[PDB]
Amino acid sequence: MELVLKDAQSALTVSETTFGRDFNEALVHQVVVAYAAGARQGTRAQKTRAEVTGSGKKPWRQKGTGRARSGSIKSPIWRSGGVTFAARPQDHSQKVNKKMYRGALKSILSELVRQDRLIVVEKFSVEAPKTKLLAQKLKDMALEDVLIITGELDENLFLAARNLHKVDVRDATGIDPVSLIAFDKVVMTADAVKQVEEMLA
């Protein structure tokens, strides 16, 4: 399909399958959920009745005592020692098929174009590594929360946006569904656009 520009007014040709396909609600949600789960690290643990410091001696005899039968000071129904099902460090990452990941990414890109949240422009660069310059460049464009995607990563643009929370700078290869969804506006360079079709295929 045809992607219009706002600065050079130059036509761009892009496959409609990767930019004009329908929006799959179910597929995108699964990929987004999978991405969040993969961000976890699951560094937690408790002590079961075997790992609690203590001794296995019976608190009192089985019979004769007037109170409930007890077996150990570390039973889960006892104060200061227990946890019936203690947690262990676990991996929460889940598998997502390559095609499913690509399909969700294609679905997300198409809808950004439909909601005009995606803006394609020519090369986006800053002459000097100054956050002030980048802020001015984004101010006249009426953009405050933007994700800058460029074909080639340059330290000059990387340093300029480092201290800008609402602004992110990324490469085409390092593109994730969550970032595209989260950011209000996405700006893609002409080079950045081309690499997307090649990797998306």
């Binding site: 608190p59 009192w60 005899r61 004769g64 005592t65 109170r67």
Partner: peptide, 17 residues
């Protein structure tokens, strides 16, 4: 609050056989 460390040992007065 504290379990009696000593439990008295009883006897069977009534065989009840």
């Amino acid at each position: 609050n504290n379990r009696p460390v000593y439990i008295p040992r009883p006897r069977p007065p009534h065989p009840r056989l």
